[PDB]
Every structure is written in C-alpha cells, then in structure tokens.
C-alpha cells in the first residue's frame, strides 16, 4: 500500500490512485510574484476558543490531533470560503533535515514541516461527504521553520512517546490550537486536494504567508515516531511529505501585497 518509500512513495500513488495526475492536485510551489493581489478576499475568521481537542493518533503517515466536530466549536470562515467549516484535526508533515519537509514551497524554497488544519464544510454534514465536494475542505496550512521553539506546540511533542508506532491513540483533551498560528494571518489561497491518497479534489488551500518557528529539540522528536507498527522493522516517520505538484490551470491569489 501508499507511503513514502521507494517502492511506495508519491511517484507510484497515481497507479492506485489515478487523481495523482488530476487537474487541481496539491501541494504546489507558491511562486510569490506570479500571485495576485486579490483585494476581494476577506479576512480570515479563525474561531478556536471552543475547540474541543480528543485524541491523539498515530496512522502509519503522520500523527493526526483530532477534534469533537460534533458542533460549531472550532470554525474557520472568511477569507476564499463561503460558509462555516469545522475543525476535525491537524497533523503536521516534516522532513529528516532541516532544509526539506513541507509540502507547498515558496519560490521553490522548503520549510523543515508544514501544518495542516484541516476542516470541512458544515453544509455536507459529515467529513466523508465533504471530501467528495469541490468545496468540501479547507486546510489552513502553516509552514515550521527551525528556531525558536514554539510553546503552544510543547504539549503535542510531550505525547509523542505515547503514540510511538502506527495504530497507537492517547487521550489529547484540552489542547488550544490557536497556540499554533503565527501572528499574521495574510495566505494565500488556491483549489487543491488532498496531498495523501486518496488525493481527491476537495481543499481550498489557504497557505499562511508567516511561518511559525519550533525549536530544532521540537522537530526532532517528530522524527523519533514510526511509520511501522509495534513489533514490526523500525522505519522512521519522516519525509512525510508529496512534492509540489504542476499548477496547470490555476491562479494562486494572495491576501496581501
Ligand atoms: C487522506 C488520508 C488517507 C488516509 C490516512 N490514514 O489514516 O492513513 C490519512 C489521510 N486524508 C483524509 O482522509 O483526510 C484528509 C485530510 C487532510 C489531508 S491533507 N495532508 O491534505 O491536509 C489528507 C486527508
Ligand atoms: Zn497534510
């Protein structure tokens, strides 16, 4: 099955998964002075002071934190969408070096991993409807750097250990995303999809222009988690992410100039 590997990683996803080669596939490199200035777009409406996190999971691909998305409690509205999508989880991809890990680039530069706030579109009722909706999703993308470490992010990485090998959960309650965004939140924005099988063409990307910066002990310890299950051969979760994929027939746009 799909990863990340040689015999399994994103060069060989479109025999399974023939969107691989579609008309609005993600990530993509952000060139920024090619973006246009879209002064029709709104702000963003990022409303997390009731999100109620759950859990804590390891999938074999990243770790995901999952939200309740039972009710309006973490929303994200404005910017590009028309209407209300909630928070169901976030999960992060992230590089064995420095120098690569996320999935969009900017002017073809790469981040050390890249956040990925995932919510869909309460008109669809459910997450697995909205995944089949053009408008479905909308992922609010966030790229690391190396630096600083970010204290909002310290309670995920302390949990790390719990959830070592593919298929371990921990109980994740009380954890404050708005802990995770950067003080801007100017983006840019473009349809996409999914950057993991079954990379269906879903998401509206809004990409945040200003990068958080974690801590090089922070990263590291994203590093030490396991794409293989318990007992079996230890391989390392990381370069946990696709590469920019051909633009085709879209117009990044940005918030901001
Ligand atoms: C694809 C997926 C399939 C299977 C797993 N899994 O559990 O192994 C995880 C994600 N997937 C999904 O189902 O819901 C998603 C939400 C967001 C993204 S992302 N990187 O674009 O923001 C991917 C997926
Ligand atoms: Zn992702």
New binding site residues.
Partial sequence: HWGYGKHNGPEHWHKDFPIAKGERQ?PVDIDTHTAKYDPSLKPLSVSYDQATSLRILN????F?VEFDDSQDKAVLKGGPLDGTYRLI?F?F?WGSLDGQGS?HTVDKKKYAAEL?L?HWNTKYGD?GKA?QQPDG?A?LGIFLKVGSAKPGLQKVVDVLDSIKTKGKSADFTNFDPRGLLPESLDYWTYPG??????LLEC?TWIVLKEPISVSSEQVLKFRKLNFNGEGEPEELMVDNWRPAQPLKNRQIKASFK
């Fill in positions: 993600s999938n074999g691909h990243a995901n989880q999960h991809h999935e990925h995932v997450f995944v999703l992922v999809s999914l950057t993991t099988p079954p998401v």
